[PDB]
Every structure is written in structure tokens, then in C-alpha cells.
Amino acid sequence: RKGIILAGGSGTRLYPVTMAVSKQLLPIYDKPMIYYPLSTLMLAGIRDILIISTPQDTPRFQQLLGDGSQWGLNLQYKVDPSPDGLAQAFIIGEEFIGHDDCALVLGDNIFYGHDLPKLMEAAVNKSGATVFAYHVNDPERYGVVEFDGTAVSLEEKPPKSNYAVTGLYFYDNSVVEMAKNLKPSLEITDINRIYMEQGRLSVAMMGRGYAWLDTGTHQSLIEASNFIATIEERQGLKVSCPEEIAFRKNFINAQQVIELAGPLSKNDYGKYLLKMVK
Amino acid sequence: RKGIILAGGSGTRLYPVTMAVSKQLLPIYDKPMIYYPLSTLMLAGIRDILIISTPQDTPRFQQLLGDGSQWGLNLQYKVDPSPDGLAQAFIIGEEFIGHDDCALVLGDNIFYGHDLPKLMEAAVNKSGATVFAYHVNDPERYGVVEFDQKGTAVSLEEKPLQPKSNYAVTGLYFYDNSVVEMAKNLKPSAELEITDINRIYMEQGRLSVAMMGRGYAWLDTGTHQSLIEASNFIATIEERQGLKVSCPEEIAFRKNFINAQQVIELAGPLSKNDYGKYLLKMVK
Amino acid sequence: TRKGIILAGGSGTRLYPVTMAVSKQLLPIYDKPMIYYPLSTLMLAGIRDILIISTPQDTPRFQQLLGDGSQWGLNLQYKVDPSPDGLAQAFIIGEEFIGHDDCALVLGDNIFYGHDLPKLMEAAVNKESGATVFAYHVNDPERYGVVEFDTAVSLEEKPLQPKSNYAVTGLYFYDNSVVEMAKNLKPSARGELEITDINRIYMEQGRLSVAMMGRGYAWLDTGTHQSLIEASNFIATIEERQGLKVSCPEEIAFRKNFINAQQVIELAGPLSKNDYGKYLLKMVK
Amino acid sequence: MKTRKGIILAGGSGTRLYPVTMAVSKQLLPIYDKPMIYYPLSTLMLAGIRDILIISTPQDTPRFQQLLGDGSQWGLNLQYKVDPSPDGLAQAFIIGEEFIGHDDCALVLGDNIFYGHDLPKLMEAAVNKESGATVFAYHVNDPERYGVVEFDQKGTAVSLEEKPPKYAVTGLYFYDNSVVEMAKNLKPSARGELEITDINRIYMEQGRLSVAMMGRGYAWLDTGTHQSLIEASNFIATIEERQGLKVSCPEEIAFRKNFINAQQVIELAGPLSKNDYGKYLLKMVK
């Protein structure tokens, strides 16, 4: 079970807060933005993860995350000169991927939903690819998919559907070859169409009960932070807390939780971890 | 007119968001935290500013702020090995300060108030020192000052298990040149303490207190909680009252540190969001 | 046979001046009057016959809002009380309404949220005998009824030295024997028939279960201006980000087949100038 | 004599707000810690207006009286008139002809919330205008939804388009005595309503309409929906908590303008002593 996190980009819409800080290290309430797409991968049972970022920020991620062994993970890093193409992920990560299937998630994508893990299990347990769709109200702004669970149409910023394609994708090994033989528009949407034309593209539907934030602007960033702070405070759970997820899925034990909770013992984050482990 | 911004520290209460990012580069809504104490200095007419930070973060501030010439400022930088003592600021910055008076502001202090500039003018136009007091509800947690009617300080208790006032001392201070010598001859506490320096001035009857009461906001960005409160406050004021708080480009323009053409060039890289657009609207 | 009581009186004096001319339980929690929440909680437990107890002055205001509840497939009845002390006085005022049946009791300003709350409530309804109270973790047990459980072990109303972090919430399930308990109950020191006394009695008899609302559950008390705006923010946030409504009686009545799509559409008519009416139309297609 | 007078329009159905307005008047809904009507009322107080007519529905008018009384507790004279909800906001000057008499008159909508350090100065100017009318304009981003005004540099209005866009006209107006006669000789609009906009145009055609500009630093909330209601509440809670002041607190305003003294403040603060509202008032008087 392998996955890739795309954690580069400029976040230019976010100036000036991204002038000296990577977008994916901005706080979403009490956690760095990257904790979220990472937790999404952990929740799907993915433990070997390649993080692709900029030359300048990649060291910052390593300082934050290390090799991920503290959480029972294997984290690797690859710098890209940020040449256009999100589908370039499968090229940069060809070695990492090898012969295995692969999930891909954007570093600024925030997913929430009690049933997301089941949805992701199905996508892992699939040949072909699974994309995740989310009902929006402004399909024009997003890649739109129209589906049967099999995809019918795919229009990058059209609207034949209310469903936007999200930044979470599941591929079988054949994607690496697709990416390598892909003509520049390198677009993930093109790759996804290919699968659809082959009748190998399923669509996981995230409807009522799911939240999906894109952290485009200052506005959505503060809305995301307010959402996480609200859910956590009112419903007594943490969202995308890697230590908690690592513990609940037995990637690590209570003793390791306690050691990790040490440096966090000055705030509610460390305390929550101690409560949890008793 | 000179000032110092203390922008180091660990921000350990803020783990894990400060593990790989300096506290003073965290966003307060649409701006890096350091824009705020910096704007406070600009609003007092201070244009020559020394930023003291850590070895690791100082480069990050330079990448963000440069030499400040884009805003009509002169920004200099000094790394400190973070040896205990906030009053060590006057020692690290002895050369920078020279013979001039000096203001000092903490990098995580966020001040808001229509009349703050007038308050700061008075402090700049003073011998002695001016501290800024803010009415709190839990004086026990803060350095507390009890002052006279003339504005002269009477008492100074760093975290009084027994408070004599509701007024906390904030992280904004104005000193005359004599502070450099005070700092140099200061005995370490049970750290070189800004509170000790402030007492010295008070014992000399040279310490005024600027009062920030009704209409003023003062946020300390201690925790995750206060950080999200600070961000919500800024977003709310800005959206409902159509003004920006602590926007250096706007302040630079309004005080003629720069002209409209320079504003427009700066607004270019920001044109994908409301920040850039606000700056263009402003210059027409 | 499934019956419930909503306590919707009181002064809400902490809430002056907003409660000077408006009942606390008619204050908006985002897009709904406060009373929709505890009412929906009852509906979710399958309770359809509900007695609303309130003040002389406000009872008419509730009736104007809610009617007899037939629009939602319910039977709502009303009883005015002179606010004689005692929340446990509910079982006395409602003795006739209750008759021989079991009974649930909810406070008019209690707001419960949780995907699994309905299952929790099913279990409490399906309890042959005894009572079920609902516990929630609070950081200041001192101002709440405090429970310690195995079946309950200890109960203290506003304990100076609380023995646990678990507050007893304003949602209770009783068997028919509660009416007699209430009638033979001695007023407490403050001169009030106390729900906590009643709950202790059940516990002393080894008949008191505790439903635990832990991770995933929200419980708001609308004590102050602060908590009121927090509750509203919570509801607005959940609804907007997760595309569901919390405690929307029309939705609940439809999903549990108390009413059909045609009735939903008629009810959605007067609400068609806002998202609430539109949500109901979307729902029914 | 010349009496500063004002009218608050506090009826309507608030149908956009169902179901929260099914059994509660819109203007009694809380905006954070105060009934909605405290805000437009405070706006009037801040302009020195102390004689105020509150026009509302048959059903709600008693609820306002229970809340506000005759206003003497705050140094005011409040009077009430119930209208059958007949078409026309400009009908205010007809219903209130007797109340107004020979005086000038301000008019404010019961769901309008104004905030701004300098609002009082703006309002002083409008009260001190010897003749004509003053409307208050607010820069919006969607002029197409609001009455729009286009004005000169002197401050004189040029154009007035009810939902055009050539600045929205807000629900705060200042008139001289001549408005009563304008209202009485006004023809109903196409929707059969006596329109404040028609009245305002008349003044403009006469070159007697000034425009007070509320730009940077001013907030204006309309409490149209559930959304704006919770935004207004958040705004008031935020400003109050972060900046240590209350917005549109009548007791505070009455005290600061000497409508009442410290002893009267303390008596009023008594029933509010279980919350921060009562405590704020006690702190204030020491």
C-alpha cells in the first residue's frame, strides 16, 4: 500500500503568508496543513508514502515529519524543480512505486467523514482507478465528473454534474506507464480520462456527511481552521491526528504515544493523546 | 526614530505548528504574524528597525521582508543564540541604537485601536520610558502595573499572586537612550528582565504608563486558541468595516513612505487575492 | 405508548435582556427556534406523543409556533405551570398525560448531536424497567449533576467535591414507576422536587443505567449569551460544511415516515424564501 | 420648541426568517446579547434623539412595550403606534404625523445595524442641516441588490435607482418637517406602496438631498437572513470581547450623554447582574 503527497507549489493566492512559509505548513487550527492529507492516507492503511515538494520546503517537511517511523510509517522525499504537471508525480515516483498500486493526494486537500475509510477500502480493494467526487454548488470552478459507479464524462472546468473531482486518487500500477506515455496538455485529468475511456474508472461519492475543504484562499483557510476547531471542541474528537490514527490502527503502541505526547504536553493536543491512552 | 522587534523564541506551546515554522511567520488571517508588531512600529513613525531572531528563522524573515526599502523602511537583522533575557535586546542592539531613543515590541504582540498612534506619539515625544497597559480580567497571569493619575507608575509585580491593578503590561515599550546602559549594568534575575529595567525607570520616577482601555484590542498569541481568535478578529474587522489591520503597504502609503506607483508594483504579486485588490482600490 | 415531556418554561434570567420579552426556548439556534432541538431528539427516539410544559405567558407562543404537531405526524399537548419549584414536578403535572406508559423527559434548552444518539435512545426505550440517564464529559463538573458508573454508582447534584467529570445531561428515560416516585418525593433543601433525587432512588434500587455520550457527541447547554452564539456557530458550521440539517423536524418526520413527500412540500412552502425550505424540496426529490 | 424626534419601523413579517419569526418578531431576535431593536434605537440615541415613535404590528407592539416601556429608564420618551401593515414604508410619516408635529424627524428601520466611531459626527451634521434631507450611503460590492445613490462632491445626490448601477442607501434617514406633507401627497408606486425612495427623489429633484458617506471603518448589517443574523451576532461578540466596548448598549449611551446618572445605571444593572452585560455597566460606573 503506497501513496504520494504533492506538497509543493507556490500558493501565490496566499501571499503574503506563503512568501516565507510553504502552504502545506500553514496551520489548519492546531496542525500543519500536511497532517490532513497524510492522515487521509494513513486511514486507508497506506504506510509507505512519498512526499514530493520544492527544493526550499522539502527540508522543512523533513524537520517536521522525519522518516515517519515515530508513527509506524515509511516517509521518503523527492524534490521537483516544479515543472508543470501534477501527473509528473508518477514519473518522479516511478522508482518508489515499482510494481505496486498507488494513491495520490494533494497536500492542501482536507477530507472529513465518518465513512471515508470504508470508501477508501473499496478503492484499495479494486484494476483501474478510483476518483473521489464531492457535490458542489459551483461545478464550473472544478473538474467535473458525470457517472453511471463508472465515470461517463470528465470536463476540466466546464457542467454535466454537480460533482467535483477531489484531490484524492487511487491507481493500479498501470498509471506509471500512462504517465510516461502522456502528452502534455502533464494532467491528472488526462490520465483519469484514459482510465474512463477504458471503462476502468470508478467514482467514490462523498455526499451528505462529508466535508471537503480546498485551502485556496485566506478565506477558505480560516474556514477550514474554524471547522476543525468546532468539530474537535464540540464533539470531543480530533480530526487528522496522526498519533491517534497510528495508535488506533496499531502502527504504534501506548508507550510510543506517551513519548510523542511529551513535547506536546503544554497544550490540549498532548493532553488529548494522554487521555486517549488511558 | 528606532525600534526593535523580538522575533525569536521557540513557541513550544504551539507545537506541532511551530516545529518547522517560526511562530512569527504563522498567519494571523491574511498576514504573517510579524506584520502586526511591525505595523505598530510604522504607525509610531519608526522607520529604522532591528529584527532580532534565531539563526534558523532569521533567513526566513529576510526572505519575507528584505531590507524593508519596498515600504520606505530600513530593516536590519541580528541573530541571537537565544540566551535567556529579553532585556538582552538593548545589548544585542547597542550599535544599532547608538545615541537615539528606542522602542521595543514583541514579535507576537498584536495591537489594535483607532487612537494607538496618538498614544505612541506622546511616548515618542517624551526622557524616561513609556509602557503600555491593558485592562485584563486575570491580572495574575501578566506583569501588572499600578499607576498614578499623572500617568506615573507606582508598582510592578511580575505575575502577582496578589494584583494591585487590573492592568497588564503589554509587549510594547518606549525608551530613551539611557536604557542601553541600564541593560548593560543589569543583574540577571533568579535572565535579563525587561521588568527589572522598567522598575528602574519607575524607581527614578521616569516611567509613564499609556493606558489602552475601551476601544483597544490586545492579543497575545500564546496558544492555538488565541491564534485562531486573533485570526477571526482580524478577518471580522476587515470584512465588516472595510479596512485592513496592520497592512504595511497601506501604512507606508498613508504616511508617505512610498507613493502610488510603488504601491501598484507591490500589489502585483498579490493580485490573485483580496489583499492585492484592496491595495489597488486604495490607490484610486 | 412512546411518550415524552419537554420542560420549556423558566426565566432564562442569565439571558437578560434577550429573554425579557422572548422565551429562552424560542431564541434562534441558527435557523431554528431552540425548542426544535430537544423536540427532534424526542422524535429521533420514536416518541410521537409529547407534553410541552411552559409558562402562562409563553405557552401560547409555543402553540402558535408548533400547534398540535399533526403537521409533523405528532401529538403535542400543553400544560401551563405557575413555576412552582421542582423539575421533577413534571411527572406530577403530566401524570394524566403519562398514564400507564413509560416516559422520556428532556429540558427545553438541551441540544444533543451525534450520529449514534438514536441507537443510544433505542436501548433506553427498550429497557424493560428502571431509568436511563445520559452522561457527557465536562471540564467543570461542579455546576452539573455528577454521575460515577459501573449501572450508576454515585449521584450528586452540583457537588462541591465532584467525584467524576461526567455530567448528567437533560435527557432522561423513565418507566411508569416514576410518577409514583415523584408523588412521594420530599422537597429538597432549596424547596424543590429534584430530578436528581428521583434518579438516585432508581440508582439505590440498582435500576439506573447510564448511556455514555463520548467521542463524536456534542452537548450544548444554552446557559449564557456566549454558549448561545457557540451553539448557533456549531449548527451553522455542521450544516454548511457537511450538507445536513441538525434537528430539522420536517426532515426527521419524513425520514421516519411520520409524513410523506406531499406533506413535506406543503410545509416547505412558507419556508421557500430561504435555504430551509429549499433543503426540504431537494430532500424530497 | 424644536424637538429631536425619530421613528423606528419595527413591524414586517420577516418571512425570509421562518421559522424563527413564526412566533417571535424579527426585531426581538438576539443580535448576540441584545434584542435587535436595541441597535437602531441606540443609533437614534447617539444622534441626540430622545423622543421616539416605534411603529409595529398589533401582535408585536405589546412585546416591544414589555421590553422597552416608555423609555424613561434611559431618559427617553417612547411612544407606540400599531399599523395594519398597509403598503408603504413612507406611511411612517402619515402614521406619525401627530407625533412629528412641526419638528424635523429621523427615520430608521428596526433591523438596521450601524457601527462606526464617527457615526455620531455624521449624524450631528444631518440633524444640523437647516432644510432638506440626509440619506446614509454605504459602499457595497453588489449595488444591484440595494437602492443605489450617485452623488456629487458637495455631497448632493445626482441619481436614485431602486435596485438598478451608477453606494447603497441605508435604512437611516433624516428629514425636515416638510416630509409629512410630501408623504401625504405621495402617489403609491406600481406595487401600491408609499415608497421612501420616492420621497428621497423628491428631495433630490429639489436639490435638497445630501448624502452622508459611510466608507472605511463603518459596518452596516442588514439582518435579511439566518446567515446575516449569525454574522451580525459574531461581529458584535467579536468587537465587544476583543476591544472591551459594547455596541448599541442603551444604558451606556444614556449614561455617557447624561440622560441618566450613575445611580440609575446601578438600578438598571441589577436585573442584569447574572451576566457580563450587568457587570459591564457596574465597571463602567466606577
Ligand SMILES: Nc1nc2c(ncn2[C@H]2C[C@H](O)[C@@H](COP(=O)(O)OP(=O)(O)OP(=O)(O)O)O2)c(=O)[nH]1
Ligand atoms: N510538487 C509540486 N506540488 C505542487 C506544485 N503545484 C502545486 N502543487 C501541490 C500544491 C497543492 O497541494 C496541490 C494543488 O494545489 P494548487 O495548485 O492550488 O496550489 P498552488 O501552490 O498552485 O497555489 P496557487 O495556485 O499558487 O494559489 O498540488 C508543483 O509545482 N510541484
Ligand SMILES: Nc1nc2c(ncn2[C@H]2C[C@H](O)[C@@H](COP(=O)(O)OP(=O)(O)OP(=O)(O)O)O2)c(=O)[nH]1
Ligand atoms: N530573539 C529572541 N526572541 C524571543 C526569545 N524568546 C521569546 N522571544 C520573542 C517571541 C515573542 O514574540 C516574545 C515573547 O513571547 P514568548 O516568550 O511567549 O514566546 P516563546 O517563543 O517563548 O513561546 P513559548 O513560551 O515557548 O510558548 O519574545 C529568544 O530567546 N530570543
Ligand SMILES: Nc1nc2c(ncn2[C@H]2C[C@H](O)[C@@H](COP(=O)(O)OP(=O)(O)OP(=O)(O)O)O2)c(=O)[nH]1
Ligand atoms: N416548566 C418550567 N420549566 C422550567 C422552569 N425552570 C426551568 N425550566 C426549563 C428551562 C430549561 O430548558 C430547563 C433547565 O434550564 P435552566 O433552569 O438553566 O433555565 P432557566 O430558565 O432557569 O435559566 P436561568 O437559570 O434563569 O438562567 O428547564 C420552570 O420553572 N418551569
Ligand SMILES: Nc1nc2c(ncn2[C@H]2C[C@H](O)[C@@H](COP(=O)(O)OP(=O)(O)OP(=O)(O)O)O2)c(=O)[nH]1
Ligand atoms: N411597521 C411596519 N414595519 C415594517 C413592515 N415591513 C417591514 N417593516 C420594517 C421591518 C424592517 O426593520 C424594515 C425593512 O425590513 P424588511 O422589509 O426586509 O423586513 P420584512 O419583515 O419585510 O422581512 P421579509 O421581507 O419578510 O424577509 O421595515 C410593515 O408592514 N410595517
Ligand SMILES: [Mg+2]
Ligand atoms: Mg495551481
Ligand SMILES: [Mg+2]
Ligand atoms: Mg507570548
Ligand SMILES: [Mg+2]
Ligand atoms: Mg440550562
Ligand SMILES: [Mg+2]
Ligand atoms: Mg419586506
Ligand SMILES: [Mg+2]
Ligand atoms: Mg431588511
